[PDB]
Symmetry: C3
Subunit: 245 residues, 3 copies
């Protein structure tokens, strides 16, 4: 296992991503272990709040270079095995404690969490367009939904990198803390969430995210239409070989 599962207190579960070899890029291993961790959480009605973090300086790094090339060649899609919507499909609140870097799909996956916390010193980017890819994995839905239309245009079109400190200065609604405090803060917030009845938490998450769960599939189809027009050029293959990490 490359994802460890740590109960905190009575009803909090910490899904810690730790594929150290790949810096939390979506290796086959990290993919399957995440699916399994969330299926385990789905099957176990004790938990009231999930905390999803990485290890050391990485939250989640996005597609592996091979994984991206497989996408370029059309062997796979960004939406496979639904990694992208794990936190949205989870029935209890999920806090994405992004204590390290969040890159590409790694950032987008965390953005479907109900609560996202950033580290001041780490890097965040929705970097699809750096390779020529129009954004995938619901990025064109969840980036404006969480960060607002205007910041999303810049983030998505330019694919630039931002320190959590830069995003805090642009007015993001996410709590931004020094790396060393992100998990501690997440844990406190998780304990406050765990004070509520599980039924009230699920009933309210259902209702708050109903528009998302309703609209997302149509936004995915739209990204799939964009992807049909942009993903499959030779230039995209060159950008992936030439500019990956």
């Amino acid at each position: 296992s490359v994802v460890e599962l740590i109960e905190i207190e009575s009803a909090i579960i910490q899904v810690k991503m730790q594929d150290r070899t790949h810096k939390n890029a979506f290796s086959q291993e990290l993919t399957d272990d995440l699916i399994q961790a969330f299926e385990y959480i789905r099957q176990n009605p004790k938990y009231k709040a999930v905390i999803l973090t990485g290890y050391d300086n990485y939250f989640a790094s996005g597609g592996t270079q091979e994984g991206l090339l497989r996408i370029q060649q059309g062997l796979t899609k960004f939406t496979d095995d639904n990694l992208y919507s794990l936190a949205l499909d989870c029935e209890i609140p999920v806090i994405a404690a992004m204590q390290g870097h969040g890159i590409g799909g790694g950032f987008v996956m965390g953005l479907f969490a109900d609560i996202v916390i950033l580290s001041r010193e780490s890097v965040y980017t929705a970097n699809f367009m750096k390779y020529g890819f129009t954004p995938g994995m619901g990025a064109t839905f969840i980036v404006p939904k969480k960060l607002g239309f205007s910041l999303a245009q810049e983030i998505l079109l330019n694919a630039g990198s931002y320190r959590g400190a830069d995003l805090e200065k642009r007015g993001v609604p996410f709590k931004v803390l020094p790396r060393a405090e992100v998990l501690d803060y997440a844990v406190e917030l998780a304990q406050e969430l765990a004070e509520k009845p599980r039924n009230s938490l699920v009933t309210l998450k259902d209702h708050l995210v109903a528009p998302l769960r309703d609209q997302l599939p149509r936004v995915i189809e739209q990204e799939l239409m964009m992807a049909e027009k942009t993903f499959h050029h030779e230039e995209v293959k060159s950008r992936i070989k030439g500019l990956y990490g």
Copy 2:
């Protein structure tokens, strides 16, 4: 007004101030406050000379939300959130309403103020959509107006976790509302009312109709969905225990 817990003052010829002054209940929705507030907005409706309304509290309180008895009657299913439509007073008013939140804004109190066209917070005061502390899902259109005014994301946190925030905390979090020291909040709302009053009433009524038409339109359905939520969560014994145990 009738109960004398709302004070109406004409600040200038076109500016009307609705001061909530239920000292006994700290501007919690007592029967008296409920009655006086409706009578006050109905007076505003019947006198179409004003251009701006300033909604404010007294001292350190803006509005405290349901009384403890009031919350207990809701969980026994004797009454509802909507019921008198207090939540939607500022949205129904045809002229712009400034919620001058000089003091604390709790529960249905906070929410009612967020339905104003302009909201101003006090730095030293406390704001909370605290329904969930008691085990209740939010009512009073909280799940519509809080995302609408503060954005989706900060709404998830405010609503799910029911925390308390000083106006400075919200300010630090990036809200769009002006945040000022308590002692400046009413002065600033008056200066703002005076600027609004530089316009023809008819432009102001016409513009607000256009701007809030999606809210007047969408709100009824969200109220429905929140009632449905209330049916699954409001009526357990543990809500009664949290109300009796965690405050009025």
Copy 3:
């Protein structure tokens, strides 16, 4: 044609549109109206560019309707009609960066709100000031202001038509980058460079998706704005 707009090619893939009607302080004269439309047409006919920087001169980004034009409306004489300048950045096929190095007033502020990336100057003044003149807002203000600045700050901006410095907006948490004036255009140039690193067809395809709901919904909002304007001459 009128020389009140200057086009500079920054690199092959970057075009700078510089508003330069010094007599009118970049207010919407006939010359600046024509020239801007002719500049957006030239850009449309030349698919070599990947990014557009729209900017002003000195302390002026764009000043909106002219004193004269507004006065003529206030007393119908006439035509409350729609010139469609406000959407040049929206209809432009490639990303537009509004580098508002100077003041952005009324329809000049709004025109730049329809750009994909907006940059403000701390020192400059910004206002959707339609209602100062007794008018409900036009040119899509009531759509693009909430969309770019959030429902709440838009209610304030459009109802009261107040003036805000860059600095005030930044303290209220706007998502636009805010810089001292002397740094606004250089920062636009760098961002335009980063954008030009992308294949053009990726820029266009994404932009089309991102702004579809704005191109789709805008005409109805314009109809509503013309309605409101009609109801005001009671």
